Design a binder for these strands. Structure first.
Ligand code: NA
Ligand code: NA
Length: 209
DNA sequence: CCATGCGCTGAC
DNA sequence: GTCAGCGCATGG
């Protein structure tokens, strides 16, 4: 797959799991190994990860409200920090807004024919609330295609403006956290994937003090 | 070129 | 738990 492919990655079913983000990147399902969103600001967003990293994220499984990135001071060669400035409808935030089936709008937009929007591959990471109903117990899990129904700017918990996006699921395969999804995962033999040599290295490191 | 970054690791 | 700061891919 080209980097700008929209839609599912062939041969990677819903429910596939990987221990580390770099493995998710290698699969093609989410090519950035740090960033939450993969997008091109004049094309759209191809995928996103829910990893508990923004306090304004709210995950309801078949739908969720995702937060834009940025509004943060990453001075000192940081990757994450708390909010310290307003977010902007630029870069990955603009990309994800362009998936919505409505022209880009600096005040937000909502699509009526929201399935006509561009698909987003969604991965859930283990981090987030304790004993989440949706997050995997370990690693990262591909949960299928979702679509951006609407997006809008709002005052975040921090008091700074954040961009927010409502995504709804649009995938024919069962959600992995449901009974049907757990049955499909069992039948397909989907299990956590680890880097070559990792479990051996772990086994060696566990031999002594 | 330079900016961005929902990770990761392990010393403390 | 807290924390600091690293390579790297990606793209503006
Ligand atoms: Na990245
Ligand atoms: Na980029």
């Amino acid at each position: 797959m080209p980097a700008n492919h929209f839609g599912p990655i062939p041969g990677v079913p819903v429910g596939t799991m990987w221990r580390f983000r770099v493995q998710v990147s290698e699969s093609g399902v989410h090519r950035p190994h740090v960033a939450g969103i993969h997008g091109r600001s004049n094309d759209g967003a191809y995928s996103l990860v829910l990893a508990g990293g923004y306090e304004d994220d709210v995950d309801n499984g078949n739908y969720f409200t995702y937060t834009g990135s940025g509004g943060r001071d990453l001075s000192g060669n940081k990757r994450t920090a708390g909010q310290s400035s307003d977010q902007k409808l630029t870069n990955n935030n603009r990309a994800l807004a362009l998936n919505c089936h409505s022209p880009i709008n600096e005040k937000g937009a909502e699509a009526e024919d929201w399935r006509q929007g561009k698909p987003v591959r969604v991965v859930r990471n283990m981090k987030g609330g304790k004993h989440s109903k949706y997050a995997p117990a370990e690693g990262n899990r591909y949960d299928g295609i979702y679509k951006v129904v609407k997006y809008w700017p709002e005052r975040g918990k921090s008091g700074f403006l954040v961009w927010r996006y409502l995504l709804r699921r649009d995938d024919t395969e069962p959600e992995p956290w449901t009974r049907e999804g757990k049955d499909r995962t069992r039948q397909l033999g989907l299990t956590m994937q680890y880097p070559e040599g990792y479990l051996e290295a772990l086994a060696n490191k566990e031999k002594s003090r």
